Amino acid sequence: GQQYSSAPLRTVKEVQFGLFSPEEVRAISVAKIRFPETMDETQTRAKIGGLNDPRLGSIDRNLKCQTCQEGMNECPGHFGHIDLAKPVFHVGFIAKIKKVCECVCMHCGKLLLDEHNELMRQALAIKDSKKRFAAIWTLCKTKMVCETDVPSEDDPTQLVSRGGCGNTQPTIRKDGLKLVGSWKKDRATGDADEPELRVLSTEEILNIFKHISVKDFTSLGFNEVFSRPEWMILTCLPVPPPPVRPDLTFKLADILKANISLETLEHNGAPHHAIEEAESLLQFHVATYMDSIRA
Amino acid sequence: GLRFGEMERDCMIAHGAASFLKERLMEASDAFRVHICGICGLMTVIAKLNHNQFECKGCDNKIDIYQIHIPYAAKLLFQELMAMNITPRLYTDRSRDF
Amino acid sequence: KAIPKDQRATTPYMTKYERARILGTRALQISMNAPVFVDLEGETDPLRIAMKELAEKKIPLVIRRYLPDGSFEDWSVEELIVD
Amino acid sequence: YDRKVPSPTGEYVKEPEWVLETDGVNLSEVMTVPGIDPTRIYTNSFIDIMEVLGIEAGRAALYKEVYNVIASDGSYVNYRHMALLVDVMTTQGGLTSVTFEETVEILFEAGASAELDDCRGVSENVILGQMAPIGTGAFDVMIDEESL
Amino acid sequence: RLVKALEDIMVHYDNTTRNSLGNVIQFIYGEDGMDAAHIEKQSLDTIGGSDAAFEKRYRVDLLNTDHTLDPSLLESGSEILGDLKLQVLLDEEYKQLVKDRKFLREVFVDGEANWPLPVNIRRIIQNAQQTFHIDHTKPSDLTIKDIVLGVKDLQENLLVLRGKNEIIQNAQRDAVTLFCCLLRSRLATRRVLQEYRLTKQAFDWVLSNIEAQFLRSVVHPGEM
Amino acid sequence: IFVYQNNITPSAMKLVPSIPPATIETFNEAALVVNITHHELVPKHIRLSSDEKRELLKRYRLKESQLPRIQRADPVALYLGLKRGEVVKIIRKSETSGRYASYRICM
Ligand SMILES: [Zn+2]
Ligand SMILES: [Zn+2]
Ligand SMILES: [Zn+2]
């Protein structure tokens, strides 16, 4: 690395954290990772355009990537990707996912409390974005309805509209990697006892998240540019280069085996329940992958 | 004892000895060098050094780019974080767009 | 984002930390056979040489002082008063 | 108690005064009792001082509790160290108390919050192979091309 | 835990003390911009004493044959008796001593006179006395104006903050208030002549030292 | 401002923020029987005009969030009727400089 670079040289003065949207991950990929294999074109123990060299790294001595060249040694590592048949949760954020879910209307995407309410105005006011989430969550996890119409501050004979919808809200529990929904009408009177339990597809949750207003997800601590709430659900998954791997490949193998067969079923037409079960092995292997990269 | 723990660092901070504190607390883990987009702080930059071509595929940029030196452990720690869908973006400038 | 030579509002006195860092950056260079700007009226010790340098005001370096808001002033070694 | 007060001719003299001292505290209400001097009432509960008289009066109580502790042992520390501490405790406007791979938990949060690390700490700077902008690192040094 | 709480606070080249966020903790370090190593217990003279006593020691009345400066204190002494326009300066210096004493007795409700401040003035004066071999037995060649205006001008150069605007000027003046009270109390006309017996040259040395020492007590940016 | 003898009702008190811009302040009487800004530990707080504020921030070059804070319901802030975003200059006696000014911005 004793070779020369015309790029001016500097120290790092700032680290800006966030999440990688699926767009930016596709965006700075080289390779689309689809086959899950090393070497042997049919049976040629050499190099495959599908995982391992498809333009990222190289053991080989070869001063070669994709006209990036340098030694098996002064090469960063380049970044791969793997488009996911279905969205899965990021394991790391199940519990965040769960509490946004609890803040927002699971039809419309709109926060359950707002300016009108007043205990919420004081949580809204808090400065520290992790105390603020905490606080707004405490106010909202209680709220069983997406209200239409709500007393104002002002002369409370009268009510005032808010952007509405009206739908009842699940009580949400955690059940591995599965979030589970439970709806009522009431707390056990006449009208409706027995809740209807029903799993939360990643698919609907991603879909509710993409509908949450900039104002409303900022309000929860998220940021329009660097971390939106959707991005806690993976869609597109980065493949690290061989500098990262010292048997994490043996695991991304398995993700692909699962991605390949959820797609071959979704292709074939295939029962409701098989599609779901292959979706759940996807998830588990994408989860295990990262809860393993804590190492 | 025979070490240099939290409290010994604190005394050196008190005296203002930053160089010492960097020397003592380094890795011998060599300073690896790395190019970095100045718009998306990431280590995505394709550096053709021989043809003198530097591109962020995705940032669509071959102007704004930097070189930095960091410990290898850190270049790994960061690519580990990217593997987990976390962007640790390194910027060269403090006060921004404003 | 830079602050014109006039209008500079920070101390005209060198601080202990600047002085320490100057002398030591310069001794590092003198210790690696870098040309020297002053008469060695005997000295062999690079720190010592550097201090002779700083006293005769022959250290061509500039201190860039950042203010908390990103902005900065540049003060030359020549100009900083050493007390 | 004795109270040093200026005399009619200008010099300080002792002038005793009775003082009451209580077990327990009701500041808002005792202040209001006829016959006392409400301008000089005190408590060692700096929380109550801040609740009744505000953040600044609490800051100045808190200092005076800190200083009592350190002088009651008989030692002496310069003002400005205790002043620093007590400012750190009151600058948000209330009284805030001062009391391979782990940690992941925290970086995930960073991610999702878009945490901006200023890079001024000594650890962060170690990880990056750099000096911390403290003391001898709180400026840069550059080559003086402008000189003869 | 205290060290973990306070560890990032640093002084900056604006003299402000701030955290790693840039928040302001203090607009100037220690409320005075000094380094605590350069601060010493000194007595602030104006504060104590009876009203009679403060007026013997500091009042100069050039229009009054009992309360002028004896002519053995000063060469000009004959020539300033009854001079009206020196008296105007001296009334001005006294009014400031008087305010000084009131101000301080509000700050120190107790009357405590001994408080840490930078630049041990007594020991500079003691040095000047040694260094210029000063005869207690000869009138001085200082003038009224040399003293009175020399001590006003020194105040302007005891600098902690250097900004051209009004706000920073007010800060600078507030920062340097208490030290200026001790200063005007120590280099008032009648003390300079009658107690210290300074010559012009020693006096001019006293000042230019006060000023270098003051400037060397200021805290340095970058201190943790 | 409205001073009352022992309470308001949960829903009286709801009638307060109610007619913007015009604001409405409530005090219990007992909290007024004594002037807390006359107490010795309470220094002089002086609300800055929004110009004063502009100037303060330009000359320190700060963001609002870098200034020390005083809450909306701090006693003195109630006493002065401050509003969020308003800055008080606090001028205190000081055993090291005699006088010192600090500032806090209402939350
Ligand atoms: Zn490469
Ligand atoms: Zn809804
Ligand atoms: Zn880029």
UniProtKB/Swiss-Prot annotation, chain B:
ZnF C4-type span: 37-59
Residues reported in the UniProt entry to bind Zn(2+): 37, 40, 56, 59
Location relative to the cell: Nucleus
Coiled coil: none
Family of this protein: Belongs to the RNA polymerase beta chain family.
Functional summary from the UniProt entry: DNA-dependent RNA polymerase catalyzes the transcription of DNA into RNA using the four ribonucleoside triphosphates as substrates. Second largest component of RNA polymerases II which synthesizes mRNA precursors and many functional non-coding RNAs. Proposed to contribute to the polymerase catalytic activity and forms the polymerase active center together with the largest subunit. Pol II is the central component of the basal RNA polymerase II transcription machinery.
Assembly with partners or alone: Component of the RNA polymerase II (Pol II) complex consisting of 12 subunits.
Additional detail: The binding of ribonucleoside triphosphate to the RNA polymerase II transcribing complex probably involves a two-step mechanism. The initial binding seems to occur at the entry (E) site and involves a magnesium ion coordinated by three conserved aspartate residues of the two largest RNA Pol II subunits. Present with 18700 molecules/cell in log phase SD medium.
Protein name (record): DNA-directed RNA polymerase II subunit RPB2
Lineage of source species: Eukaryota, Fungi, Dikarya, Ascomycota, Saccharomycotina
Full protein: residues contained: 1127 to 1224 of 1224
From Swiss-Prot, chain C:
Protein's cellular compartments: Cytoplasm; Nucleus
Source domain of life: Eukaryota
Protein name, entry field: DNA-directed RNA polymerases I, II, and III subunit RPABC2
Gene name per UniProt: RPO26
Remarks, miscellaneous: Present with 6090 molecules/cell in log phase SD medium.
Region annotation (Leucine-zipper) ranges: 40-61
Native source organism of the sequence: Saccharomyces cerevisiae (strain ATCC 204508 / S288c) (Baker's yeast)
Gene Ontology, cellular component aspect: cytoplasm; nucleoplasm; nucleus; RNA polymerase I complex; RNA polymerase II, core complex; RNA polymerase III complex
Similarity section: Belongs to the archaeal Rpo6/eukaryotic RPB6 RNA polymerase subunit family.
Keywords: Cytoplasm, DNA-directed RNA polymerase, Nucleus, Phosphoprotein, Ribosome biogenesis, Transcription
Function: DNA-dependent RNA polymerases catalyze the transcription of DNA into RNA using the four ribonucleoside triphosphates as substrates. Common component of RNA polymerases I, II and III which synthesize ribosomal RNA precursors, mRNA precursors and many functional non-coding RNAs, and small RNAs, such as 5S rRNA and tRNAs, respectively. Pol II is the central component of the basal RNA polymerase II transcription machinery. RNA polymerases are composed of mobile elements that move relative to each other.
UniProt KW Chaperone keyword: no
GO BP term, pick one: transcription initiation at RNA polymerase III promoter
One function term, GO molecular function aspect: DNA binding
Curated annotation (Swiss-Prot), chain D:
Record's comment on post-translational modification: The tandem 7 residues repeats in the C-terminal domain (CTD) can be highly phosphorylated. The phosphorylation activates Pol II. Phosphorylation occurs mainly at residues 'Ser-2' and 'Ser-5' of the heptapeptide repeat. The phosphorylated form of Pol II appears to carry, on average, one phosphate per repeat. The phosphorylation state is believed to result from the balanced action of site-specific CTD kinases and phosphatases, and a 'CTD code' that specifies the position of Pol II within the transcription cycle has been proposed.
Cross-linked sites for Glycyl lysine isopeptide (Lys-Gly) (interchain with G-Cter in ubiquitin): 64
Signal peptide: none
Cellular compartment(s): Nucleus
Job of this protein: DNA-dependent RNA polymerase catalyzes the transcription of DNA into RNA using the four ribonucleoside triphosphates as substrates. Largest and catalytic component of RNA polymerase II which synthesizes mRNA precursors and many functional non-coding RNAs. Forms the polymerase active center together with the second largest subunit. Pol II is the central component of the basal RNA polymerase II transcription machinery. During a transcription cycle, Pol II, general transcription factors and the Mediator complex assemble as the preinitiation complex (PIC) at the promoter.
Annotated family: Belongs to the RNA polymerase beta' chain family.
Full protein name: DNA-directed RNA polymerase II subunit RPB1
Name of the encoding gene: RPO21
Covered range of the whole protein: 1287 to 1450 of 1733
UniProtKB/Swiss-Prot annotation, chain E:
Highest taxon of the lineage: Eukaryota
Parent-record interval covered: 840 to 1063 of 1733
UniProt domain comment: The C-terminal domain (CTD) serves as a platform for assembly of factors that regulate transcription initiation, elongation, termination and mRNA processing.
Subunit (UniProt): Component of the RNA polymerase II (Pol II) complex consisting of 12 subunits. Interacts with DEF1; the interaction is direct and serves to bridge RPB1 to the Elongin complex in a DNA-damaged dependent manner. Interacts with the Elongin subunit ELA1. Interacts with the Elongin subunit ELC1. Interacts with ASK10. Interacts with ESS1. Interacts with RTT103. Interacts with SHE2.
Subcellular location: Nucleus
Similarity section: Belongs to the RNA polymerase beta' chain family.
Record's comment on post-translational modification: The tandem 7 residues repeats in the C-terminal domain (CTD) can be highly phosphorylated. The phosphorylation activates Pol II. Phosphorylation occurs mainly at residues 'Ser-2' and 'Ser-5' of the heptapeptide repeat. The phosphorylated form of Pol II appears to carry, on average, one phosphate per repeat. The phosphorylation state is believed to result from the balanced action of site-specific CTD kinases and phosphatases, and a 'CTD code' that specifies the position of Pol II within the transcription cycle has been proposed.
Protein name per its UniProtKB record: DNA-directed RNA polymerase II subunit RPB1
